[PDB]
Amino acid sequence: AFDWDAYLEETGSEAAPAKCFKQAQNPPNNDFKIGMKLEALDPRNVTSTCIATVVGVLGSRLRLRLDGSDSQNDFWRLVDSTEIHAIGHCEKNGGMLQPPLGFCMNASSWPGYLCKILNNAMVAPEEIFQPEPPEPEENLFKVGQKLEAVDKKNPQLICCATVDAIKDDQIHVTFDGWRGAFDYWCNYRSRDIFPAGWCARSCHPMQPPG
């Protein structure tokens, strides 16, 4: 557990208040189990809803892999992400499930594939999907404020970071102790940013400065 209070004191810094973040006040409970299947937007084509399997769990997050793709493009979503849903959600809403971009077979072999993978599948029930947190009405972040941020190049990691700059709805996230190597701009509504102390509260590891 990272001593944020000691760190903010020695850097003469403030943590961005919880109200800046599109995150729940308390980290949402994670009742997902490894092997559970669900529907997720394909990160390599966000127009597509695909079958994903929980291949890992960490704090309030899921490590997801798209069925019939590869093991090199896993992605992490919170249990209260709006990009994941129970199986049947897509169809209920007028849509069709799609093959993943990295599908390992040919596209005509898709309809049969879906039947095979969904057959007697472990499915995440709709009740363990958590409600989407309320979002801030404006960008409340201020330059100099510290927070916890996902390293988008190594998304298993959530790290000590600082808001470097602000342009309207975008904040510039810099990772303390890492000389701008994996900084990024993101919307203030990002699900990849958390208030200081959130990881400890959710039983997710939190990386100290580089």
Curated annotation (Swiss-Prot):
Disulfide bonds: none
MBT repeats mapped onto the chain: 2-100, 108-209
Cellular compartments annotated: Nucleus
Subunit structure: Scm associates with the PRC1 core complex containing PSC, PC, PH and Sce/RING1. Forms homotypic and heterotypic interactions. Interacts with the SAM domain of ph-p via its SAM domain in vitro. Interacts with corto in vitro.
Note on domains (UniProt): The SAM domain is essential for function.
Role summary: Polycomb group (PcG) protein. PcG proteins act by forming multiprotein complexes, which are required to maintain the transcriptionally repressive state of homeotic genes throughout development. PcG proteins are not required to initiate repression, but to maintain it during later stages of development. They probably act via the methylation of histones, rendering chromatin heritably changed in its expressibility.
Protein family membership: Belongs to the SCM family.
Name of this protein: Polycomb protein Scm
Full-protein residues shown: 175 to 383 of 877
